[PDB]
Design a protein around this nucleic acid. Structure first.
Ligand SMILES: NC[C@@H]1O[C@H](O[C@H]2[C@@H](O)[C@H](O[C@@H]3[C@@H](O)[C@H](N)C[C@H](N)[C@H]3O[C@H]3O[C@H](CO)[C@@H](O)[C@H](O)[C@H]3N)O[C@@H]2CO)[C@H](N)[C@@H](O)[C@@H]1O
Ligand SMILES: NC[C@@H]1O[C@H](O[C@H]2[C@@H](O)[C@H](O[C@@H]3[C@@H](O)[C@H](N)C[C@H](N)[C@H]3O[C@H]3O[C@H](CO)[C@@H](O)[C@H](O)[C@H]3N)O[C@@H]2CO)[C@H](N)[C@@H](O)[C@@H]1O
Ligand SMILES: [K+]
Ligand SMILES: [K+]
Ligand SMILES: [Mg+2]
Ligand SMILES: [Mg+2]
Ligand SMILES: [Mg+2]
Ligand SMILES: [Mg+2]
Ligand SMILES: [Mg+2]
Ligand SMILES: [Mg+2]
Ligand SMILES: [Mg+2]
Ligand SMILES: [Mg+2]
Ligand SMILES: [Mg+2]
Ligand SMILES: [Mg+2]
Ligand SMILES: [Mg+2]
Ligand SMILES: [Mg+2]
Ligand SMILES: [Mg+2]
Ligand SMILES: [Mg+2]
Ligand SMILES: [Mg+2]
Ligand SMILES: [Mg+2]
Ligand SMILES: [Mg+2]
Ligand SMILES: [Mg+2]
Ligand SMILES: [Mg+2]
Ligand SMILES: [Mg+2]
Ligand SMILES: [Mg+2]
Ligand SMILES: [Mg+2]
Ligand SMILES: [Mg+2]
Ligand SMILES: [Mg+2]
Ligand SMILES: [Mg+2]
Ligand SMILES: [Mg+2]
Ligand SMILES: [Mg+2]
Ligand SMILES: [Mg+2]
Ligand SMILES: [Mg+2]
Ligand SMILES: [Mg+2]
Ligand SMILES: [Mg+2]
Ligand SMILES: [Mg+2]
Lengths: 119, 101, 88, 73
RNA sequence: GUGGGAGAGGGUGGUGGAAUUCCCGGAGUAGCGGUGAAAUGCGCAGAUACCGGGAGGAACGCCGAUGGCGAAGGCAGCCACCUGGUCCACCCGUGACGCUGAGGCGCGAAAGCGUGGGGAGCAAACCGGAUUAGAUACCCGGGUAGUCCACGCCCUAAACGAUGCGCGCUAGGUCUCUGGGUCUCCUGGGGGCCGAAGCUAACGCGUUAAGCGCGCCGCCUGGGGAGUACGGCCGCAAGGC
């Protein structure tokens, strides 16, 4: 128990899953949720629907902390990124801003063969 | 003897004494390496696009000098010795290139 | 590198007559300047190959010019070599 | 692509070689810290080539950013 | 020679930020990861997701191009030093000093070798999960040499434009990089595209010839046997010629 009421919401979305971390404005996590936090186990975690349920679960557990308004930060390309966004907008948390923080190297590190033909 | 521009970014948190000290040391190095100071622009505390040594701001100094080439690199190294010196960039001077002129 | 005054100094040194820029003596003198400087550079920087090709080309040019001089006026050749201290 | 307006066309006379001038150089970067392509900046090959080095110098001086966050997505 | 220019040409030192991994701290909890679907794997000794700090290695996003530089291999953050080549203008100097080039000498991607450092990510071999009739493979989880630096070897290739080098001659059009000029246009050096004449078995080439010519070098002479055997030279070896 905190009583924060305003915070950040991080949507980390890859092709295999979506995980959502609601935090206080200092960045420290309050609650988190994912495809697997809900019933889903296999590839189904990567589903947009899974992202919806995850976003909603994170938002619910967050509103238990008395959270009202959040700022959304998005990382990574994958399905259910925009679905997580939309679910957060429909969540009952006022969404202030949305931002794409997705990490990219400046030609830094050699990829796995699967990600190659690039660097 | 070639013409260069020394850029120096310093710690914004320096008061009068420490700052005047840093400037005196800088000019003592410029002297010791044979650099002659032509024109000086002190811009001062300005915002940065990214933090430098944890600080959101920096104290900017600009010198235009004439010094021997062989010593240049060495001089820069000396300027980097100081703890309160954030950045040193020595650029070989060039004539302006105008667009829409 | 080679500045203007250095270059002028060597040109007016080997010039056959006042105003002589491109005579064989001056050319060999200039080439010798560049060659000694570049060889000095390659004393260090032994891993710079690309410059070394330059050295090769310069040396070739000089040897060709000198060969022409030897062919034409053997005395002027002898004098030039003695002066610059080449071959050997 | 490059569908709005002409970065060089609306602008004054300026030294392309000046790294310390932030207010003018900002205009050549996108929402992110990225250097705008020619099709935007409206510059020429030589001009662009100079602009790049100027901007990079400024970045190292801490005057311009390297990368930035995208907003309202 | 004088004056002016563009350039990831090369060598040395310095230096910047992003990302990955690891370590420390905070907050937080039931999974993360991965695939066609999964499983191995990792996680209650607290992972994944988030923030703060630190360490290290390697590579330089945007600019970036249908672009530039180099003899070729090849060259890309930024700064300074050292250094090679090249283009243009002036028409100033020397006065055929030229071209080619068997041998020689040097350079020569990757992998590979030697000594010593280094080691984040990736990864032959290998160890596992899966798939399959089987799966020695493709897919997934790990992972050593190696990939990195210094010095010394190796000398290969679809080392490709599959097009030796130099010079002269033979319509134009069009885009582009870089100079100069009387600057809508003219003139020079690069890089592309369409095409006169002409050439070509055809495909195509066509002032960046594969056209018309001259000079010099290298090479070919049905396929397999075979880049093998023998010999010689080179190499620590692999192996090369
Ligand atoms: N910036 C210096 C450069 O050094 C080069 O070679 C040097 C660099 O490769 C390297 O310098 C340091 C090294 O001392 C130290 N042990 C580790 C450090 N990471 C290295 O620096 C470098 O490492 C590699 C090089 O491939 C890069 O990936 C990395 O970005 C760079 N920082 O080690 C070499 C000897 O100092 C070249 N001489 C030239 O590019 C340039 O001068
Ligand atoms: N070449 C390296 C790069 O050179 C650029 O600048 C280079 C070019 O702008 C400039 O070219 C000049 C040319 O302007 C001038 N009109 C004639 C001169 N011969 C050329 O210089 C050339 O020849 C000389 C030998 O004589 C070499 O030492 C030099 O490397 C080579 N560029 O020479 C400079 C040095 O090579 C970059 N500014 C520099 O940062 C970088 O090192
Ligand atoms: K065709
Ligand atoms: K032997
Ligand atoms: Mg999944
Ligand atoms: Mg690369
Ligand atoms: Mg590449
Ligand atoms: Mg270069
Ligand atoms: Mg921790
Ligand atoms: Mg417990
Ligand atoms: Mg543990
Ligand atoms: Mg380590
Ligand atoms: Mg690109
Ligand atoms: Mg190539
Ligand atoms: Mg004349
Ligand atoms: Mg005469
Ligand atoms: Mg030969
Ligand atoms: Mg090799
Ligand atoms: Mg290698
Ligand atoms: Mg080794
Ligand atoms: Mg791996
Ligand atoms: Mg594998
Ligand atoms: Mg070994
Ligand atoms: Mg070993
Ligand atoms: Mg080596
Ligand atoms: Mg090819
Ligand atoms: Mg070609
Ligand atoms: Mg061609
Ligand atoms: Mg042309
Ligand atoms: Mg042209
Ligand atoms: Mg025809
Ligand atoms: Mg054609
Ligand atoms: Mg043959
Ligand atoms: Mg036969
Ligand atoms: Mg037969
Ligand atoms: Mg063989």
């Amino acid at each position: 128990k905190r009583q924060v009421a305003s915070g950040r919401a991080y949507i980390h979305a890859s092709y295999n899953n979506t995980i959502v971390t609601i935090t206080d404005p200092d960045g420290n996590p309050i609650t988190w949720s994912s495809g697997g936090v809900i019933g889903y186990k296999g590839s189904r975690k990567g589903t947009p629907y899974a992202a919806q349920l995850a976003a909603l679960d994170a938002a619910k557990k967050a509103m238990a902390y008395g959270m009202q308004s959040v700022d959304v930060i998005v990382r990574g390309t994958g399905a259910g990124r925009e679905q997580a966004i939309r679910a957060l907008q429909a969540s009952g948390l006022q969404v202030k801003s949305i931002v794409d923080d997705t990490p990219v190297p400046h030609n830094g590190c050699r990829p796995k063969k699967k990600f190659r033909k690039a660097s | 003897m070639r013409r260069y521009e020394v850029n120096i970014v310093l710690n914004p948190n320096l008061d009068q004494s420490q700052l005047a000290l840093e400037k005196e040391i800088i000019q003592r190095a410029l002297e010791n390496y044979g650099a002659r100071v032509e024109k000086v622009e002190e811009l001062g505390l300005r915002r940065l696009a990214y933090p430098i040594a944890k600080d959101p701001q920096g104290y900017f100094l600009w010198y235009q000098v004439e010094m021997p080439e062989d010593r240049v690199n060495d001089l820069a190294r000396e300027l980097r010795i100081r703890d309160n010196v954030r950045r040193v960039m020595v650029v070989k001077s060039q004539e302006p290139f105008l667009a829409n002129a | 590198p080679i500045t203007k005054e250095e270059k002028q100094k060597v040109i007016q040194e080997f010039a056959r007559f006042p105003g002589d820029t491109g005579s064989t003596e001056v050319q060999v003198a200039l080439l010798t300047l560049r060659i000694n400087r570049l060889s000095e550079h390659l004393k260090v920087h032994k891993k710079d190959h690309h410059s070394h090709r330059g050295l090769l080309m310069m040396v070739g040019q000089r040897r060709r010019l000198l060969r022409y001089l030897q062919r034409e006026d053997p005395e002027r050749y002898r004098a030039l070599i003695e002066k610059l201290g080449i071959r050997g | 692509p490059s569908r709005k307006a002409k970065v060089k066309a609306t602008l004054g006379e300026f030294d392309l070689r000046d790294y310390r001038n932030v207010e003018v150089l900002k205009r050549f970067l996108s929402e992110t810290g990225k250097i705008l392509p020619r099709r935007r900046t409206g510059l020429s090959a030589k001009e662009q080539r100079i602009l790049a080095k100027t901007i990079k110098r400024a970045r190292i001086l801490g005057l311009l950013p390297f990368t930035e966050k995208l907003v309202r997505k």
